[PDB]
Amino acid sequence: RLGVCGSVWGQNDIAYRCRTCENDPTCAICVPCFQNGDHNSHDYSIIYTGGGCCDCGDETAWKPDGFCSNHK
Amino acid sequence: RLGVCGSVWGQNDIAYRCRTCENDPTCAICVPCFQNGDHNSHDYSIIYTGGGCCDCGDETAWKPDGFCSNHK
């Protein structure tokens, strides 16, 4: 559609790591952002976050081709 | 052929609005997707996007009959 997520996790909340899309190993995206992007052949995993915030839409934390349809 | 576009616009990049195909007035498709679909008697216009991403292939933003040959 015509035009950062920043959703927040608590201690035991799950999220996705995607090693193909991350800027570095501390980056992560929320489950909705993961589900609305394309990671089909990517090396992704469900993680327990220990808290933090979603990197989707932030080119300094996540590769743009890994953004979801709502944060491009 | 056998089986979302998500191409991204910058601020001053053009795209197409199709009022016949859009799910709402904030939806748009890129020029290649417009040219590879059928909008013959549709109420379409070239627009300056102000940024965003192409909705072609996403049934939640665009009517499937409006998808191009590459996103069906």
Ligand SMILES: [Zn+2]
């Ligand atoms: Zn998110």
Ligand SMILES: [Zn+2]
């Ligand atoms: Zn997102």
Ligand SMILES: [Zn+2]
């Ligand atoms: Zn990925």
Ligand SMILES: [Zn+2]
């Ligand atoms: Zn497109």
Ligand SMILES: [Zn+2]
């Ligand atoms: Zn298309």
Ligand SMILES: [Zn+2]
């Ligand atoms: Zn149309």
